RNA sequence: AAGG
RNA sequence: AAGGUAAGUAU
RNA sequence: ACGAUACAGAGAAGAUUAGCAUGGCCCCUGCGCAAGGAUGACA
RNA sequence: AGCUUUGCGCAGUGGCAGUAUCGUAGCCAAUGAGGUCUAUCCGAGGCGCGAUUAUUGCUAAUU
């Protein structure tokens, strides 16, 4: 956390945008949600899908190959 | 009402099912439709209020879209705000000399700069008002009761 | 007064905040406490105001200072004078002014 | 009944507190005392700058002399 | 000292965000309960 | 700015 | 006789 | 040596305000690490 | 070949509580911390001190 804060303050990293959900949509951007409801909904869902995609990519990237699963099992 | 109906159907291809009140538009099309409707609302508010839609802030736009009414303060309310608040950046640029008395009852001539009791009463007899009153006096000349 | 009741404050701050009920009580009955018949003595004219204090009633003086802030007395006099000016301007011909 | 204290301005030159509005500030600044204090402050700033310059040149001279003496001592110790 | 009836919570432009909760809300409008239609005839008469 |  | 001084900045 | 004048005068109150993320706790889900449990399958 | 248990990470979603969360080149502690109930029985941290908007950051306003 300290490293991320130092990166943000130093300018190497952009500041973190607020996390927004469906229940959090109005509380974060009520002024923007009134003028453009569908656009704000699309932006919020895009952020949520980006978070989910990052989670899946992290999980899958670090996944034992099917042959590698056997290699661990064939060795133990 | 009339323009909004035309906006709700950009093309004759767009149709409404008998059991749906609103047109069946895709998720992306609704963004453009909402933008167009917001532009309608802002433009008509500007037309009715003689203001430009560019200078309206996000909070003002939200208030316009909602039912919140930004009513212009009355002439009485404008005067109340002036009295209720201290003079804005009061500048004592004008000095007035009046004949007064001191705390010991001695007649004295004092020069004062505080901007109180300095309002000017523009009367109907003051020549400054009557000068512009006599301007364009030929309007009364065309219509006569001979 | 309600908001400050539940805030972290020092003893002096809370002691100062317990006087508002007394100030309200004093100004409610001010035309009675602030009398020359009640407090026999000299009069002191409140600054920026036409109010005479017949005694040091700081509980009343503090709340009278707020009411006549921003030169309210002068503004009232000026507004009344201006309104009478418009009244007499509207009746120039009828009153032969 | 909420008490709002009027803003107050502190004149550093005269070391006094005045009301923070255009009339009072301009009246104070236009006064003789404020002008005298400003002139005195400018004179003191100039005097302090000149004194600091004299002190730093004296310190540079003293350090140069001490460095020369130390270099001579180190040289004669090396030759020993 | 106050004269007007005590003010109750009102749906304003500030608490508008609080409206979007998971609880059930209803919007009751009686503007169009008694409704009439008038037409302006070219003769200057208007009908109801 | 004026007074002892 | 008091418990009744506003704190000032200018001239 | 006050006071008179001209100016200011609210002459007694961090009155602050929302959003998000961290942190605590408790599950749930996915992935990795290290161990292990129980069971099924004909020539 | 699947299934599944425990512990440790890494994330995601969700819920709860801000009279509490940490820090320990301070001290004591399974060679027993701490014991109102069950005591020839219970078995783990306790104490002192320090930090604080009863964890801490940014962001947006007013300033």
UniProtKB/Swiss-Prot annotation, chain A:
Q: Which organism is it from?
A: Homo sapiens
Q: Which gene encodes it?
A: PRPF3
Which residue ranges run through the membrane? Answer: none
The entry's linked illness reads: Retinitis pigmentosa 18: A retinal dystrophy belonging to the group of pigmentary retinopathies. Retinitis pigmentosa is characterized by retinal pigment deposits visible on fundus examination and primary loss of rod photoreceptor cells followed by secondary loss of cone photoreceptors. Patients typically have night vision blindness and loss of midperipheral visual field. As their condition progresses, they lose their far peripheral visual field and eventually central vision as well.
Q: How does it assemble?
A: Component of the precatalytic spliceosome (spliceosome B complex). Component of the U4/U6-U5 tri-snRNP complex, a building block of the precatalytic spliceosome (spliceosome B complex). The U4/U6-U5 tri-snRNP complex is composed of the U4, U6 and U5 snRNAs and at least PRPF3, PRPF4, PRPF6, PRPF8, PRPF31, SNRNP200, TXNL4A, SNRNP40, SNRPB, SNRPD1, SNRPD2, SNRPD3, SNRPE, SNRPF, SNRPG, DDX23, CD2BP2, PPIH, SNU13, EFTUD2, SART1 and USP39, plus LSM2, LSM3, LSM4, LSM5, LSM6, LSM7 and LSM8. Interacts directly with PRPF4.
Q: What is this protein called?
A: U4/U6 small nuclear ribonucleoprotein Prp3
Report the subcellular localization.
Nucleus; Nucleus speckle
Describe tissue expression.
Highly expressed in retina, liver, kidney and blood. Detected at lower levels in heart and brain.
Swiss-Prot record, chain B:
Places the protein is found: Nucleus; Nucleus speckle
Tissue specificity: Widely expressed.
Describe the function of this protein. Plays a role in pre-mRNA splicing as core component of precatalytic, catalytic and postcatalytic spliceosomal complexes, both of the predominant U2-type spliceosome and the minor U12-type spliceosome. Functions as a scaffold that mediates the ordered assembly of spliceosomal proteins and snRNAs. Required for the assembly of the U4/U6-U5 tri-snRNP complex, a building block of the spliceosome. Functions as a scaffold that positions spliceosomal U2, U5 and U6 snRNAs at splice sites on pre-mRNA substrates, so that splicing can occur. Interacts with both the 5' and the 3' splice site.
Quaternary structure and interacting proteins, as annotated? Part of the U5 snRNP complex. Component of the U4/U6-U5 tri-snRNP complex composed of the U4, U6 and U5 snRNAs and at least PRPF3, PRPF4, PRPF6, PRPF8, PRPF31, SNRNP200, TXNL4A, SNRNP40, DDX23, CD2BP2, PPIH, SNU13, EFTUD2, SART1 and USP39. Component of the U5.U4atac/U6atac snRNP complexes in U12-dependent spliceosomes. Within the minor spliceosome, which acts on U12-type introns, interacts with PPIL2 and RBM48. Core component of U2-type precatalytic, catalytic and postcatalytic spliceosomal complexes. Found in a mRNA splicing-dependent exon junction complex (EJC) with SRRM1.
Tell me what this protein is called.
Answer: Pre-mRNA-processing-splicing factor 8
UniProtKB/Swiss-Prot annotation, chain C:
Q: Give the fragment's position in the full-length protein.
A: 1510 to 1606 of 2335
Write down the disease named in this UniProt entry: Retinitis pigmentosa 13: A retinal dystrophy belonging to the group of pigmentary retinopathies. Retinitis pigmentosa is characterized by retinal pigment deposits visible on fundus examination and primary loss of rod photoreceptor cells followed by secondary loss of cone photoreceptors. Patients typically have night vision blindness and loss of midperipheral visual field. As their condition progresses, they lose their far peripheral visual field and eventually central vision as well.
The listed locations are:
Nucleus; Nucleus speckle
Q: Which gene encodes it?
A: PRPF8
Descriptive protein name: Pre-mRNA-processing-splicing factor 8
Q: Where is this region: Important for branch point selection?
A: 4-17
Tissue spec. comment:
Widely expressed.
Question: Can you quote the domain comment?
Answer: The MPN (JAB/Mov34) domain mediates interaction with TSSC4 and SNRNP200. Has structural similarity with deubiquitinating enzymes, but lacks the residues that would bind the catalytic metal ion. Contains a region with structural similarity to reverse transcriptase, presenting the classical thumb, fingers and palm architecture, but lacks enzyme activity, since the essential metal-binding residues are not conserved.
Please tell me the species this chain comes from: Homo sapiens (Human)
Q: Origin, by domain of life?
A: Eukaryota
Membrane-traversing stretches: none
From Swiss-Prot, chain D:
Q: Where in the cell is it found?
A: Nucleus; Nucleus speckle
Using the UniProt entry, name the condition the protein is associated with: Neurodevelopmental disorder with hypotonia, feeding difficulties, facial dysmorphism, and brain abnormalities: An autosomal recessive, severe disorder apparent from infancy and characterized by global developmental delay, poor or absent speech, severe intellectual disability, hypotonia, and musculoskeletal and gastrointestinal abnormalities. Brain imaging shows aplasia or hypoplasia of corpus callosum in most patients.
What's in the domain note? Answer: The WW domain recognizes the proline, glycine and methionine-rich (PGM) motif present in the splicing factors, as well as the Arg/Gly-rich-flanked Pro-rich domains found in several WW domain-binding proteins.
Q: What is this protein called?
A: WW domain-binding protein 4
Underlying gene: WBP4
Job of this protein:
Involved in pre-mRNA splicing as a component of the spliceosome. May play a role in cross-intron bridging of U1 and U2 snRNPs in the mammalian A complex.
Q: Where are the zinc fingers (Matrin-type)?
A: 9-40
Query: From which source organism is this entry?
Result: Homo sapiens (Human)
Question: Assembly and partners?
Answer: Component of the spliceosome B complex. Associated with U2 snRNPs. Binds splicing factors SNRPB, SNRPC and SF1. Interacts via the WW domains with the Pro-rich domains of KHDRBS1/SAM68. Interacts via the WW domains with the Pro-rich domains of WBP11. Interacts with SNRNP200.
